[PDB]
Amino acid sequence: EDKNIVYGPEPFYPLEDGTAGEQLYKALKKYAQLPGTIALTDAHTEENISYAELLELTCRLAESLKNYGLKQNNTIAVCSENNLQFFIPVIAALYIGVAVAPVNDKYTERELINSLNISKPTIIFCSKKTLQKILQVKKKLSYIKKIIILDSKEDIGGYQCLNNFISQHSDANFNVSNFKPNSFDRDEQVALIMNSSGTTGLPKGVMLTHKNLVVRFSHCRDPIFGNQIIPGTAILTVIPFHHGFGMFTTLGYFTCGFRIVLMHRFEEELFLKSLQDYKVQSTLLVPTLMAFFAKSPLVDKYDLSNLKEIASGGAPLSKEVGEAVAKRFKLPGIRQGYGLTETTSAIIITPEGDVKPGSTGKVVPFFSAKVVDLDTGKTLGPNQRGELCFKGDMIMKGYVNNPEATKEIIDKDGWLHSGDIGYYDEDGHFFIVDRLKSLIKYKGYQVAPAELESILLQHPSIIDAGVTGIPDEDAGELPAACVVLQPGKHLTEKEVIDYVASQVSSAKRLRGGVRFVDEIPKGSTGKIDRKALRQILQ
Ligand SMILES: Nc1ncnc2c1ncn2[C@@H]1O[C@H](COS(=O)(=O)NC(=O)c2csc(-c3nc4ccc(O)cc4s3)n2)[C@@H](O)[C@H]1O
Ligand SMILES: [Mg+2]
What structural domains and CATH numbers belong to the chain? Predict the structure, then answer.
């Protein structure tokens, strides 16, 4: 009952009033008043956008959009790789209550069409790289009335660039000082529309309101649950802005006044060189990169003494990998957050002063969590694996034009069934075991790939691993593993199999075998492509 529900503590300070756009405006103005403060920095080009510049461009774009005709609750879309201009339309739209629909720049035309069919945006801000595929899909979509190019200073083939759009729809000499964003109902007005397949079905549009965002803004500035770097510190993120993992970490970074160093593509040398050169103290990565930090010798070639806040998210992180990273960088521990697109941001975060190796942290302020038995549905106590369910102020309003799917993930009481298996210890630390759909069905057993992957990652010669089940007529699914080896080292199939067998019960053995590969098929936020693993392991 109530005794088994875990609640987040009170926020260090109460929730700030206003919309997400108002809090972002106040933050940009605030840091813009300090000389030399930089908001965005492209690691590839070394170009930067100061806070003053970002305030000018977001306020001028909000005015240009209002003059153009956009009203409250209209929708725009952003299809662009990570770059300096990405967040200009996001913040400008939040200023005036326009909903933002980020769309993966790597989407095929079919995927792009379905996502745009859900959000139905009036304006699509794209990049030079995505201009052509947008032009292709737009031919089929009547609702798209305008295309703006974010990273070009000149118009291309009859399509307008950001600077010329702003110049066309806003008067030069526009006083930014006097610009004020709109005030509206933050509990009802949608801020962003994110894409997620949820737990079953095809991709859907997740509606996140301004309230959900201001809650995240509270979190990210909380002395206990927020980033542990001071305003002006440099932070490097490799997460894509179009995903909630990147979107709601970076948007909070603006409210903290950090210098956000971004990359549109992870490259080991540019990544480490950027960390040293910008004296980065915080970095946001995925488990594969945590393994890189734990085992790559290249880490020793760069001055990373400034780095102290190393965060991971998006997928299960091996306990031992985290410990190895903390140890190598002589840190008390690492940072982690756990969330879903439907919960806007991370709902379980490692709090300040409270680390527990293997645990992704504790329930964040304004949230409650529970673990329910996968059979009886009943709540469970500490150290009992079940389906993690959540409830709180960052839960989505629902899926766009799809009440059914919303009722299929948010039950009648208000609990969001995440679809992940995990547990919580006696101190309230949560542990994510793995996604339910990822569990391997070996005879009457369900083996968690993350467990075997953690074992594989304990080996000094393995830098990455992906585990899934291969079809079998008698057993159903046989656990098998794809393994990425440390350059210069070698391992046989038998070595890996015996290494795992000596540590796990008979049901978890790698009966499907082992295939060595150059990389593990994974998504941009750490999601292991199980289907691709099976193809490889066949
Ligand atoms: N930390 C984690 N540990 C284990 N598993 C994790 C995980 N995060 C996501 N997952 C998995 O991705 C699934 C959700 O996928 S999803 O729909 O595409 N959405 C997401 O993965 C998602 C949305 S927000 C977000 C995070 N925000 C953060 C902010 C700060 C910080 O320090 C860490 C984080 S993680 N992750 C989860 O159900 C879960 O299975
Ligand atoms: Mg999703």
Answer: 1-13+354-432 (2.30.38.10), 14-50+210-353 (3.40.50.980), 51-209 (3.40.50.980), 433-538 (no CATH)
